[PDB]
Amino acid sequence: AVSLDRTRAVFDGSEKSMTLDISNDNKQLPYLAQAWIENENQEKIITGPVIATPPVQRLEPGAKSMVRLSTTPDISKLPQDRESLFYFNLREIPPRSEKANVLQIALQTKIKLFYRPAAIKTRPNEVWQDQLILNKVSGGYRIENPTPYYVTVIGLGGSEKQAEEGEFETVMLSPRSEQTVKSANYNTPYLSYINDYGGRPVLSFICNGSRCSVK
């Protein structure tokens, strides 16, 4: 199977292109790798504002290559004070099985592609997720994301272990938004999220009544 090098891609709006590494992990057969972009509703767009090339390429067993993500002039039309959401897709076209009477599975990877305008370009060590605010309500918390970035929440517990381990319905807050999640009550809430690199940091909150903020 053909695999990508990451679980999310961040397109730095200050640049006009970027590349993602792919590789054919199969040690026997060569694969075709289809790549395309989808908008925030997971609908395929072939005209921009973000393009993927090549649309298809051949990968020898164990070989690695890349896909180039680039923008069009219409990229300027997206708002510049917040991230926009796209999805990058890579589907493998396996070799025709010699054996007939078979069901062949074509694997595909779909990851979020965050367009991040130059006006909100982040520093290398910048952490904006510590700006999240938790408001206790019946059955859980109303999470507020006042930042210009999408934030994916993967955990929420009364300890560091629960946050990262505990069962949780992952949700992604769009820029400057809020949404309620189900959860037990915690004295010192801990929240886990997926950052730009795929790391899963844990945050610690301190509460002042029903409103909790990062320590």
Binding site: A1, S3, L4, D5, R6, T7, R8, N24, D25, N26, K27, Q28, L29, N89, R91, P94, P95, S97, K99, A100, N101, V102, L103, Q104, I105, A106, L107, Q108, T109, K110, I111, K112, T152, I154, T170, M172, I194, Y197, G198, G199, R200
Partner: protein, 121 residues
């Protein structure tokens, strides 16, 4: 590398559900229900799986068309023809031949393809 990579699917091997040598003339209600289990090895689950592909006409929502008219492959979640499959850890799915018509079928051999998307959070 700096970027945490996505999970590897059944050790980068090819996934093929083989039905062996069978005549497309079956009961499609309990036949070559071939079950498949593919492994998911991740770096850190936060992943969704959607299956899509060409479907036959009719009201069924879990049947893939094949290269044989009136003949398709029905899909079910987990081992067993119980719960249908609308079109570290493991994922099991059951595939069973299905013919939506009586009469002659143009083809002794059949093959079809479905896409299995790993959608990351």
């Amino acid at each position: 590398n700096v970027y945490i990579p996505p999970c590897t699917i059944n050790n980068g091997q090819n996934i093929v559900v083989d039905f062996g040598n069978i005549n497309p003339e079956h009961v499609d209600n309990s036949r070559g229900e071939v079950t498949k289990t593919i492994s998911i090895s991740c770096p850190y689950g936060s992943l969704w799986i959607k299956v899509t592909g060409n479907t036959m006409g009719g009201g069924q929502n879990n049947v893939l068309a094949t290269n044989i008219t009136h003949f398709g492959i029905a899909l079910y979640q987990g081992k067993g023809m119980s719960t249908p499959l609308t079109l570290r850890s493991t994922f099991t799915f059951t595939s069973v031949p299905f013919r939506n018509g009586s009469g002659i079928l143009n083809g002794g051999d059949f093959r079809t393809t479905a896409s299995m998307s790993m959608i990351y959070n």
